[PDB]
Amino acid sequence: EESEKRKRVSSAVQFLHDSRVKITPAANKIQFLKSKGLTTEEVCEAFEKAGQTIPLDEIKK
């Protein structure tokens, strides 16, 4: 749980840093990360650690 959480968040951060990912809508990114088993908590953390505007309009909670 703990180790898999750390790894998910870290993978999400590198994901958000990908130049091809960055130019896509926030919605795409959230939905993909959710399909990757991240919690909304972890999604929010990833955006923070990646220094990217946490997408405020959060539909999928």
Note the residues at the interface with ligand ET7 (CB under 6 A): 8, 11-12, 15, 18, 20-21, 24, 28-29, 32-33, 36
CB of 37 to ligand ET7, least distance (A): 7
Alpha helices (H) in the chain, listed in sequence order? 2-17, 19-22, 26-35, 40-49
CB of 1 to ligand ET7, least distance (A): 16
DSSP state of 23: T
* C-beta of 21 vs 44, nearer to ligand ET7: 21
CB of 39 to ligand ET7, least distance (A): 12
Which tokens in the block code for residue 13?
A: 């951060």
Mutual orientation of helices 26-35 and 40-49 as an angle, nearest 10°? Answer: 120
